[PDB]
């Protein structure tokens, strides 16, 4: 059981990018699996996967808006429901964490 | 075998601009502080001494401290976020001669009407009763706030935090103050009168002392003449009266008896 | 420690001598005394003033609220009836914003909260409710001649009060935050009542449709709290769409808002919120964990599975607090107790539970035989990675309460919990008996208002718009249909699981845009059967609308309506829609002889059968084109080879013979 | 518990601001400045949870001008 990096990238690129493009025709269940395969395979390679080689600049304040932004969140009401907020924490912690 | 870079530069440029887009509504304060609190502990508890891995800007404490200032209201649980979070950016950088980090968030205007704000007010008042207290929690996180500001401070110049002190002592004893009314959270005033009174006031100034003397000797005079003439106990309280001497052969009499204890160290 | 109230006797003297003042000047001015009325009620509501910290008696401010209730202002000056609404409206804005998010009350206790409407389909709120009664009866004020004093064309201090754009700014915000539960199944109780008659007042005494819908206007047209900006949308709610819907109720205001441009306004809105917002059904994903039979009021309790422990080196074992069943309520001896020492304030107990789990509720039950060891205030504090405990809110006063019940606003994923507990304040041990936690989970057999969370009450608007008044309809077609991306959008919407409107309504409002022109026509068409994704839409943009996540040519009866109705109407422009459905057909014919684009490699059998129905049901009748010069022999040819290449004793082979 | 004390016996006039008994044993409200009194008034207000009042003995204290009873 070995992964090697070069294949892994676009893999996870293609992933994360279609995170940012759901929309009312997406259902939350579904992103709840892709948050946990993402980070799971960004973690399983020898030379983990960094943050920065995974999104862009414009890309990556998309996603922090997402969790923090108040034009998806209103007030009680979240992005994707508690479960997809904490699956976004868990997921940017866990890449975070296994590059540092 | 290839090179790769760091995460964490690009990280700095979104979090400066998250924090830069605060003033004008964009962005939740509560979720932005959590997510901030949890990323940059990620070097697994909110220990007072540890370096954020993420570092901030002086333009975005400025701008947190104007959003504070006005904030209209704040839950519980938004002011533990805010306190973990100033302890936390006491610990930071602004290299990357520039003064410290706690040297610029004495010096600023508006951490005395923050601090106020959350000593003086409560949670919002709805129709459901709570205690006019506030917990273990948020009160240790007070004092460990207060802690790291002083420690910080001692070795360069520690005027700046007794005179810091002094001041929001008097505002918060003045007239229509929290003292004079009895407003906020006793447990949290507490725990900083008796922080208070082990700190050393060398350098301080002349007019800050006396304007402390002074609205201190008026509410505690105030405070003696006008008492209720009803008093009434559980079986369990011993404690002597306000107005009762020689005793020796939480309350608020307790807190008056500190800022005497303060009067009298002056 | 003394309540914050003042007595039966001294309210009751208050009452009398504000009578006897009343009563004195009665005869001689009552303006005065109705202006020092208004002034000291605008001085106790203004900003640090005693309503918005909530410092007095309670019960004397209600009484004064009372006895203001029934007086008389028709000779008061102007300025301080606007200031007096100004103070009012934000203080009432301010504490619909800010509330709790910890809900407790005792079993006794029945009121509804402050954002719940339509109910009938002291307390502070109370308060609140009366100061938004004498708004209601200000606003209904009218003027004098010179507009500087109420009076004893006839103007109204409505239309002073239209014109103030913050005041109207606030009570719209406000009311978009309330919430109902008997609409949703399709007088006044509470606060959100209180603003919803005050604004239908205000729409009752506008004495011209622009200005009520001017306000209305505005505030659709930005985000939160005013932002700019894309993909920034303006809070709905059902009672804000209730009283949108009672505005646009006649001929005059609806052609008024369509000269406005705010038909143009709701379709942009309808479209960019579509892209800002994940649909949070349940999917296949769903369906087929439940089929691997587990994974990782209709709640349920999780305290028998997790474990319980303190911080007191010396205190006894409490894993009974977490048994199901409860003790007997006559047992004379507490399932826990604890023992304070003499410079102890607090307590805690920390709950482990194996997994994270949406909590909604905490239940604490104290040792009923005696209640003089029930703990004086309770703290709670929930952590979701199971390390860091963070507080929920100020502690709950318990004193003389024989049962403890906290609801969470909004549920919480959590995963440990702390409960710490105040000394009592006669005895020195507490005593309790069980301890229960309630939420919910992701899945398995324990995972058991709609326009704020979606983006359907702009179909709500448009509907109604369009169908409302037969005779505008066509005017309002004209204003829609250029718009980009409606379609999609609309067609998005109709395939997915009820979401608060009924699929008929969507159907009327797709054949109503789908027939005021040719082009459209086709357009629908081509949605329905062979593409149905936004149109220049690149995923680089991070902005435009995506409407990926559905298959193309899916079949339903909703869709087999919409065909059928646009196959089978007369009018100019048919002949086109009986082309393309013919060009469908037989470029769904022609890509089977394979031996690229979905829907044309599956043409649903429903759709085929539709279309022979539509053939025939129109040769049946008359058309004013030649329908048999449209059927080729070539047509002919490919569905009979079609038919010879399909296997036998299937629906696509029965769908082809019907056509044929 | 609130508290009122009449000195003639027809006009009463409260003492103070309410007194919270929630939770309490025994109840013992003290004057600072002893009174003189003929007609005591107590109103006593709904329980949080219950419905119903239940007491068992009142007492008052105090002093004459003459007699054994100082």
Same mark, same amino acid.
């Given at each position: ?100 | ?266 | ?23 004195? /000047?009665?005869?001689?001015?009552? +303006? &005065?005394? #109705?202006?020092? %009325?208004?002034? =000291?009620?605008?001085?106790? !509501? ?113 239309? /002073?009060?239209?014109?103030?754009? +913050? &005041?109207? #700014?606030?009570? %719209?915000?406000? =009311?978009?935050?309330?919430? !109902? ?480």
């Amino acid at each position: 059981f070995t992964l090697a990096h070069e294949r892994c990238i676009s893999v996870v690129q293609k992933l994360v990018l279609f995170l940012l493009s759901m929309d009312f025709t997406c259902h939350a269940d579904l992103l709840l699996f892709v948050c946990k395969v993402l980070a799971r395979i960004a973690n399983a390679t020898r030379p983990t996967i960094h943050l920065c080689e995974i999104v862009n600049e414009p890309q990556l304040e998309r996603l922090l808006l997402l969790l923090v932004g108040t034009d998806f969140n209103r007030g009680d009401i979240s992005w994707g429901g508690a479960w997809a907020q904490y699956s976004l924490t868990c997921m940017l912690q866990d890449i975070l964490a296994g590059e540092l | 075998l290839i090179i790769q870079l760091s995460s964490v530069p690009m990280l700095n440029v979104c979090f400066n601009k998250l924090f830069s887009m605060l003033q004008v509504h964009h962005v939740q304060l509560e979720s932005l502080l959590q997510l901030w609190l949890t990323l940059s502990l990620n070097s697994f508890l909110y220990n007072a001494n540890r370096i954020p891995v993420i570092s901030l800007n002086q333009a975005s404490i400025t701008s947190f401290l104007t959003v504070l200032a006005w904030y209209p209201n704040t839950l519980l649980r938004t002011w533990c976020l805010v306190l973990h979070s100033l302890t936390l950016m006491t610990n930071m950088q602004l290299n990357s001669t520039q003064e410290s980090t706690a040297h610029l968030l004495v010096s600023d205007p508006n951490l005395i009407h923050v601090l106020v704000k959350f000593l003086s007010g409560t949670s919002p008042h709805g129709t459901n009763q709570h205690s006019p207290q506030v917990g273990p929690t948020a009160t240790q996180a007070m004092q460990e706030f207060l802690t790291r500001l002083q420690v910080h401070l001692s070795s360069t110049c520690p005027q700046i935090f007794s005179e810091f002190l002094l001041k929001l002592i008097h505002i918060l004893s003045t007239e229509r103050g929290a003292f004079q009314t009895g407003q906020g959270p006793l447990d949290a005033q507490v725990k900083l009168l008796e922080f208070t009174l082990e700190q050393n006031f060398e350098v301080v100034s002349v007019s800050t002392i006396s304007a402390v003397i002074e609205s201190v000797t008026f509410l505690v005079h105030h405070y003696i003449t006008c008492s209720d003439k009803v008093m009434s106990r559980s079986g369990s309280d011993s404690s002597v009266g306000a107005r009762a001497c020689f005793g020796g052969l939480m309350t608020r009499d307790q807190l008056m008896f500190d800022l005497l204890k303060l009067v009298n160290i002056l | 420690q003394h309540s914050p109230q003042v007595g039966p006797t001294a309210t009751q003297a208050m009452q009398e001598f504000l009578t006897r003042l009343q009563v004195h /000047l009665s005869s001689t001015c009552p +303006q &005065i005394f #109705s202006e020092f %009325l208004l002034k =000291l009620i605008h001085i106790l !509501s203004t900003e640090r003033g005693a309503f918005q910290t909530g410092q007095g008696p309670l019960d004397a401010q209600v009484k004064l609220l009372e006895f203001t209730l029934e007086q008389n202002f028709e000779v008061v000056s102007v300025s301080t009836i606007s200031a007096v609404i100004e103070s009012v409206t934000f203080l009432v804005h301010h504490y619909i914003t800010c509330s709790d998010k910890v809900m407790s009350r005792s079993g006794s206790d029945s009121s509804v909260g402050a954002r719940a409407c339509f109910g009938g389909l002291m307390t502070r709120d109370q308060l609140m409710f009366d100061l938004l009664k004498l708004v209601n009866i200000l606003v209904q004020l009218p003027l004098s001649g010179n507009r500087e004093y109420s009076a004893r064309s006839p103007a109204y201090v409505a239309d /002073l009060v239209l014109a103030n754009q +913050q &005041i109207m #700014s606030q009570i %719209l915000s406000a =009311l978009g935050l309330c919430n !109902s539960s008997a609409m949703a199944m399709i007088d006044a109780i509470s606060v959100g009542d209180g603003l919803f008659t005050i604004l239908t007042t205000l729409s009752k005494k506008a004495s011209t449709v622009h200005m009520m819908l001017q306000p209305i206007l505005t505030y659709m047209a930005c985000g939160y709290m005013g932002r700019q900006g894309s993909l920034a949308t303006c809070q709905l709610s059902e009672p804000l769409l209730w009283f949108i819907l009672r505005v646009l109720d006649t001929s005059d205001a609806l052609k008024a808002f369509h000269d406005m441009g705010g038909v143009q306004l709701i379709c942009n809105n309808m479209v960019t919120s579509t892209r800002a917002i994940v649909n949070t059904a349940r999917s296949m994903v769903s369906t087929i964990m439940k089929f691997l039979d587990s994974g990782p009021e209709g709640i349920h309790n999780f305290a028998p599975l997790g474990t319980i422990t303190s911080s007191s080196p010396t205190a006894q074992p409490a894993e009974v607090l977490l048994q199901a069943t409860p003790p007997h309520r006559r047992a004379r001896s507490a399932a826990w107790s604890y023992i304070f020492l003499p410079e102890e304030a607090w307590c805690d107990l920390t709950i482990h539970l194996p997994a994270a789990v949406l909590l909604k509720e905490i239940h604490i039950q104290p040792h009923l035989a005696s209640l003089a060891t029930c703990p004086s205030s309770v703290s709670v504090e929930v952590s979701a990675d199971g390390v860091n405990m963070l507080p929920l809110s100020t502690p709950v006063v318990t004193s003389g309460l024989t049962y403890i019940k906290i609801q969470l606003v909004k549920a919480e994923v959590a995963s440990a919990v702390c409960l710490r507990l105040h000394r009592p304040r006669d005895a020195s041990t507490l005593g309790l008996s069980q301890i229960k936690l309630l939420g919910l989970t992701a899945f398995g057999t324990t995972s058991s208002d709609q326009v704020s969370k979606t983006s359907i009450g702009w179909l709500r608007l448009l509907h109604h718009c369009l169908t409302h008044i037969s005779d505008l309809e066509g005017m309002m077609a004209s204003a829609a249909a250029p718009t980009a991306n409606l379609l999609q959008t609309c067609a998005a919407l109709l395939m997915s699981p009820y979401c608060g409107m009924h699929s008929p309504n969507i159907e009327v409002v797709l054949v109503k845009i789908g027939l005021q022109s040719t082009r459209i026509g086709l357009k629908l068409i081509d949605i329905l059967l062979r593409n149905c994704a936004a149109s220049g839409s690149d995923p680089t943009d991070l902005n435009s609308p995506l409407l990926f996540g559905r298959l193309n040519g899916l079949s339903s009866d909703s869709t087999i309506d919409i065909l059928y109705q646009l196959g089978t109407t007369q009018d100019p422009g048919t002949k086109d829609r009986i082309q393309a459905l013919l060009k469908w057909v037989s470029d769904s014919a022609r890509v089977a002889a394979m031996k690229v684009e979905y829907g044309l490699l599956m043409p649903s059998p429903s759709h085929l059968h539709c279309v022979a129905a539509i053939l025939w049901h129109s040769y049946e009748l008359l058309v004013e084109y030649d329908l048999p010069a449209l059927l080729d022999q070539e047509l002919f040819e490919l569905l009979f080879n079609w038919s010879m290449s399909l296997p036998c004793n299937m629906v696509l082979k029965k769908a082809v013979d019907s056509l044929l």
